Amino acid sequence: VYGGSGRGDLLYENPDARRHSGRALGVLNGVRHSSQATMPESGQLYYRKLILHSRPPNGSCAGLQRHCHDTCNWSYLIPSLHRCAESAISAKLWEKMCQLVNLTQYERQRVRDGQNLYRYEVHQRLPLLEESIGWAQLDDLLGWFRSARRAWVRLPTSSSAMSCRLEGHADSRDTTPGRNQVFDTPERVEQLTEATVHRIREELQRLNSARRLARDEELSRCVEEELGWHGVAL
Amino acid sequence: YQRGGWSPGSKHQKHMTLNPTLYLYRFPGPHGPGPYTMKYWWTLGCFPTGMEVPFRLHEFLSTYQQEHVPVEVEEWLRCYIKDPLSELVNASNDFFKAVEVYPEVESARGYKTLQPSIAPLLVPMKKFEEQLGVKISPVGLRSVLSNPVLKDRFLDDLFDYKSYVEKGGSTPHRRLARSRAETTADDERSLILLLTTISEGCINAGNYSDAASVLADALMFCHDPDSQATTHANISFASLLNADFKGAEYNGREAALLQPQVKPTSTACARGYVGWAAAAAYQDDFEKAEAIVKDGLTLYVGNEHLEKLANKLQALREEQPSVYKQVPRSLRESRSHLPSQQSRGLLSGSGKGFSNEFDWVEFKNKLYPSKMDPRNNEMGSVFRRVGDLGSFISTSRSMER
Amino acid sequence: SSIFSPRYDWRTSGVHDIAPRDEGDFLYQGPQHVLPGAHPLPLHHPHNTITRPVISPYIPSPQRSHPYFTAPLPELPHFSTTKPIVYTYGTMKERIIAPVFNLKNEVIYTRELDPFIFGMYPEVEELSKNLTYWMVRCQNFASKWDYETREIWRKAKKNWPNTGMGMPRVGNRKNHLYTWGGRTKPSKPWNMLMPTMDVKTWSKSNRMMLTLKMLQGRLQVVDRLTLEEPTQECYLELCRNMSWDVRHTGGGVLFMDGGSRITPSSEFDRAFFFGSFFNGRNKIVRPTVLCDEQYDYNKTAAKQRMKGPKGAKNPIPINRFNAYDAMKHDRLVITEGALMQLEDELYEHKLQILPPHIRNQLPEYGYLDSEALGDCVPS
Amino acid sequence: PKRKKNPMQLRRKVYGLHFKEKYLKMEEWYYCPLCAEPKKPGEWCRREDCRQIKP
Amino acid sequence: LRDRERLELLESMRHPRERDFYQDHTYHNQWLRRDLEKHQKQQLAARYKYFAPDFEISPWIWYPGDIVEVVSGEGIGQRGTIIAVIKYKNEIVVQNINVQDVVIPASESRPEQIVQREHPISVTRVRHVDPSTNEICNIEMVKVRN
Amino acid sequence: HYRAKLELDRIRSMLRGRARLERKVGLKRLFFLMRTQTRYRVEQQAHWE
Amino acid sequence: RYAFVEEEGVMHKVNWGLYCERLETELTVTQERLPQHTLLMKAVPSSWKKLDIDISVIRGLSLREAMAQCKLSLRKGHQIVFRALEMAQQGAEAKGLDKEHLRVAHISCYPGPTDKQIDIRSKGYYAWKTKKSSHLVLTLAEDPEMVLPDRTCLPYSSLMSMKRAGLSAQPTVIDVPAITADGI
Amino acid sequence: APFKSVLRRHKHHPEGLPLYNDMSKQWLCREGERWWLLDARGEQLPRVAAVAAQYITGQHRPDFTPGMITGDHVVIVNIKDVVMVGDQWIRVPITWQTAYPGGKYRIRLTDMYERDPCMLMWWFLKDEVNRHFVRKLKTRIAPLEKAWLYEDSIHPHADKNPRPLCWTDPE
RNA sequence: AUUUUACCAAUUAAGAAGAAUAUUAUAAUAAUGGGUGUCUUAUAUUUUAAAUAAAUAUUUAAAUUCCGUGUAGUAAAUUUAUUAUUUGUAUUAUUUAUAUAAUAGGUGUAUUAUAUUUAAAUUUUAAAUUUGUUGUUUUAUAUUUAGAUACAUAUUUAUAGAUUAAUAUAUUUAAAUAAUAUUUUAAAAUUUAUUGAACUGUAAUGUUACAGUUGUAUGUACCAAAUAAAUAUAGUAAGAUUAUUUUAGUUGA
RNA sequence: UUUAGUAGGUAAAUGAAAAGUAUAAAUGGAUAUAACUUAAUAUUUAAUAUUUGUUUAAUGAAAAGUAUUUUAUAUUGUAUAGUAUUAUUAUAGUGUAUAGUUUUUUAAAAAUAUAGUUAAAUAAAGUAUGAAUUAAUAUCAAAAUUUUAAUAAAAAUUAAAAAAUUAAA
């Protein structure tokens, strides 16, 4: 998991499978025994550890000397979701939907694909968001709600896409440890929504000139309309 | 004889009999044209061998086709230019939104948290600069946003500027149209305050040149006597920190001259006097600095800055007897003592082995070798080897020239 | 790879993503679960009646020697064979009766099929002989031309002495060792081979293939193959009505046009021939299984400017019925005229094959009533 | 000119001391009190003050 | 450093002692009609593939003022009026179909200005729309005596 | 002639410098190592142990 | 075209175009948000072998000392590195990074274009001299905790020469009141 | 793969050569070490050397492992009283050589004894240790340092209670 | 106060029409020497001859002969015909490019013998040549690529002797009538046709004349010269020769 | 080095794909393999040899070059050789004698080349550029002794061989 996609990484990469390669592997950098010429024993935890840790640092991971990126920062995670929604649904289509069910088949499929991509991105970013709840900011939480609205996914406060868990029999799902899989996605997202609502309330309580008066007014109006749209109060 | 491949790109030696070749002085390699062949391409217009066929279709498409525009389109584009007022309003709106949504720095304990990079603020900054004819320093903005108090004193000023512009007031545009007289308006004052905050952030960062430029733009915008005095004092301090003594002295003198137009409550006059005295001290004219400080005290007795500068000059005067006089007029400016001066020397200093008077000599706009330098006919100069072109002997020496 | 080589299992991980798809991936409930494609026999083409349905009264069960009728059922006007049937060696020894369809896809009557044609039990060796002949014959021999040392166009002179230079002794370097060089014995169209087929083997293999199709139930007898108009829309409509899947991935249809029962013809019907030119897989073949005795006038290199492969100079025409086409096209359609022509052209061969103690009886039973001698009205 | 060399045989030179002295040396310098430029002791400018008094 | 802008920087970086000879002249004559590199020829062909003989469309059903719908490309299903037609390129310009920015380099009298104009669209992409049916309909050239 | 080209290029990562960098040198060294180890196992390892 | 992504333990199909555009956008924005400026100079007029030595010399230094060493050196590689450092410093200034806290976080070169020149030889022999070029990568990051050595110190010889000349060994530091907008 | 640096420790280097008694390596273990006293009075020199080497190299322990260098220290005393069977004292040669052309030194056990008897005992111990381990410098050297030699009966290891080493000859 | 030991590491996903009126064979209907930037002038722009040749031939017999260098009208003007830029990218098949590059700041040791980490042990080229089997001989820097031809198999129509020198004799058991191929690189070669005297060597007074059964040591930096064509007994020179895990007889006659 | 267990068809040398042999069409390793003659590329030699542009006393043709003379200044045409180069080097026909008709780095030494017995000058490293022969080779072959089929760093025994730089056959 070192050299490939990690915790909050979006790219899906099966390190054992040599995808994204133009050459048939001739040399295996991580080799412990000469027998691995014909019996690599990949998949076994220890040998796989050796191979993956011998792999070089790709774009996702960072070297020990290169300066990493604070991907676990809420102020970065939220705008990532906003950009995902923006790319998924064009500004013209967003304006049309806001003004307005009479839509083209291509536009409907585009909206569905955007919702699916947003759900996948939320699934991938969930652990980082959960870790970054504590030191988030009111503007970024409001941005979280705005990004959900723009993606057109209604959060499960208790169309809708988070409320239904993905299909698949429990006896075949990938339960392997070390992979950030969230089987209880709707419950986790509902808990995150409640936590961010409480955090917004606490931030407003802590906060309690013309510029600041206008900021407070616009913030209150936003909070109100966004929570009403998502089906939340206070 | 033959040792490597037959192609010219092969490394090892060849012989004329086995692999006869044409005289190719210098040609690209398997990996594409190099810097030397490209220098030949740009200077001579083709590769030095001459067997290559020049092909700059892509360059033509990039430059001439792009810059070509018919007369009618060129004439109507100016008339169809966007609306300056609306564009400025939109630029201010988006800039304020970006600044407001800029995250606040986490005050970590035990070390200094890295300030988040300003990616989305550049484009709003660029458009705002284009609209207002001003240039904001990204380092200054970064420092202002990182500091909490400066962040508020910048946001409030920007919001006031937005409100006054939306209310229908564009003081610079109106003044320009009328010129094509009155005092400073609320919008212009807010803009000046915003620029002063940016300059303060620049000074805190250490970018004194950027601070001075921002304050100069603010001075250009301002027209009130009090605003002019304050901006001149700020520019004088910025130039002093930036090691621009002539500019600091000029701004201080201008502030001291505007003194009468300013009300007694303001301290811009005292600040200008202090800046002028500091510029004189850095120029190493202690008598002039003392006289200026005396005049400033006679004007505003009790000013804290004037008292501090007088005490410092008194300490310097007490140290002077060790020298028995002031710095001799011969040098009068030699010593350099500012970190700005050190940075300038590190950047533009003549390095050893390059960027010196022996490496290349810059003519009017062109680079020359030291031997062709027209500023000295030294022993390594081609000008030395000329003499007696045919007019007259021109020199008494009879060995060369 | 090779099963015994270590490379066959040198890869031990990464083949499968342990996370299954949420679309179609399922689990094995138990033996009661019916898995798609599962079958105890190694079926490289695991088709069923739904995929490629068979046109025959019965599914070809082992209990039945052939899916078609074994007796002339009274529900239909059964028709006998044009020529008398004698069971030669290799024939199924069983009565073959098949229903004849019309252009409306509904049976009109029943027809006897000659065992010597549709009753000769298939044999893999003969079928493979036919298939290999067809595969070798259907190559573009004109495209098998390669350069030669004498054709490389290089100076005919030693490029440098043996020892003077310091490189390997090479003179007139047109040889294969050099990238620009050629081969001493390259491949040429006139050096390639076109196999010579025997009429006996060709007929035997074609009749074996016809019997194989009959056994598999892919055979269908049609009264006529005429179209209202010579366009392609009419042909497609006829295919739709008759439930013929002529798509490139539908199974395909082979057509022995010939003619109707009352007017057999050796030439394809004009309208149907014009309308059968369709992109999808659908082949039209002549109503004959014999082949003109192949010959090779240039059996030796007597004509040096012969730009054709060594061997028979009279290869089987493409449109002729063959094992390759019979296997590629799922369903086979044969007209009454085609059956008449096949029986007419194979009757003499069958009689000649028959042994002497049956040959002598032939005239006694009336299988040699010659119209030329007035013994019977002309056939 | 008799046999090819391997990476370690090439790295022997960097192991040595002459290579380090010729390539891997750091110069000690300071900011000149007059011109405030980087300067190595013993070398000065052609400015009048530098010539008269040599920092 | 291979660009004309960085040529001066490259020359300054290069040492004085290394000399380049053929700065103004050349050994081989440069006024001989010779061929270009293979990649240059391929780029030329790609850039102007309409130079080939009989590149245009013979019937040429497409004329300005018609109504067409885009069947392939970026915009699919969007229909409009043919603003302009480029016959020798086999291209069409349809209002509000293929809109892209058209930058204009600054000059001594005006600054840079960004303008949007419908760009040419390949003829094969669009299909004619019959006004009466208001759907996609095949078209064919016909001759009539007025 | 068959050599363990594909089988030994896999473990070619276990050598140093020229052998690990250049396919031919690494393959030759690995072939020699495998043969010598086989000989040692079949004629001296048991005796030593 | 769909792309398979592992979600909730099962593979899920997502729009491949959106997936790719999102991945590239995230990579680019993450790299931009990283508090460092990276510069690439192509076709450097110096053989990569020689340039690597100067790169190793300059590696792991603050921007100030890197510039000082490059200016005080007499090597083509050091001059090229000085030019690269100047360009990277300008880029960092434009990007907003603090100049006084700049440091080199990566300096490396790899082979680039290569021109060839004919060198005549006696006895009719000849070869092709190789004109090598390099690609230089220079990354300037920020290290707020970085503390720089005090290079303002000067030799006692310089101190006493200045004293003889009458100058002051210490700098003439004058307190500079911070700019204020009270008068506005 | 393992890489032994070409920059080794040389006898001419100021850093000098180590003493494996004070070294700390994965293959050095002095925790299980014991101390024996070997009185070589009237005992044949080759036999004494072999007996001492058996304990010095650690071959006398059931946990012996060729890779691991663990052995008991042996204090050899009364080396002056060591005996040689017959005329061997003057008829047994010791041969060494320098890189110079002349180079060769042929000397007698009598001369080696007159210079330093402990040197002769060290020579025989070295011969045994080389006989058993010769392919590795560490193995060739460490047991020799484990060995202790004293020509007289006075040794400073009384603070270790070296138990007397009792053995029997093949006869 | 001061300071982070020496040594040791690795190649991969490719940014954009920097690859097609493309490469080879294939058309049996054209044809007075194709030459654009060409553009009067025709004493000065003439190539013809009964022969194996840009016209190219369906079998094994007999037969001259010191290795038999070998087979006829098949139809008589009868369709085996030297074709050919598009009224299908002509058709069918076939073949195809190395422009382009951050990769990691330390798993093994630190007084010397060589991958698999418990320390050790083992270890120090391959191919051909050498039949007195070597220590003789030759080749190999490395990466990728190019590179060599003996048909492993015969289903009903179907039918197959011998024999004398010769005449002649013929008491007396078979059979799946099929042919076309035959490593590869390299001989001091020789043969045909042609050019060179600007170098060099003569005669004439820099130039002219004389040239490969040959002009005067040499005839344009290998004189058994140079250029063009060719695959000679390549054999009784030599070298190379592409497919591991195998499944049966003799080791100096 | 007189045997079992386990692997495991059998007692040793004539490749393997059910995927274009396509109905097959989004996650098919169809991994199916020439160490020396071909072609291209990357290295070693290479921190290398070489190169290094501060000083000038003097031809008026032609074959020979064709290097864009913006207008160079009857008809027609003016400058910029050859030795594969901007090289050892004046191409000399005619013809003349004061036009200064103007590009050769560097702070020592070896070696090499020039330079009051008898029969002392010039060519450095370093900055910069950057070849060529060569190259089976593991991080390598101190040394001695002994021996094996021709030099035998091939073998064994014995012994103790540091790294870099320059020079020396």
Ligand code: FES
């Ligand atoms: S001012 Fe620094 S050298 Fe003179």
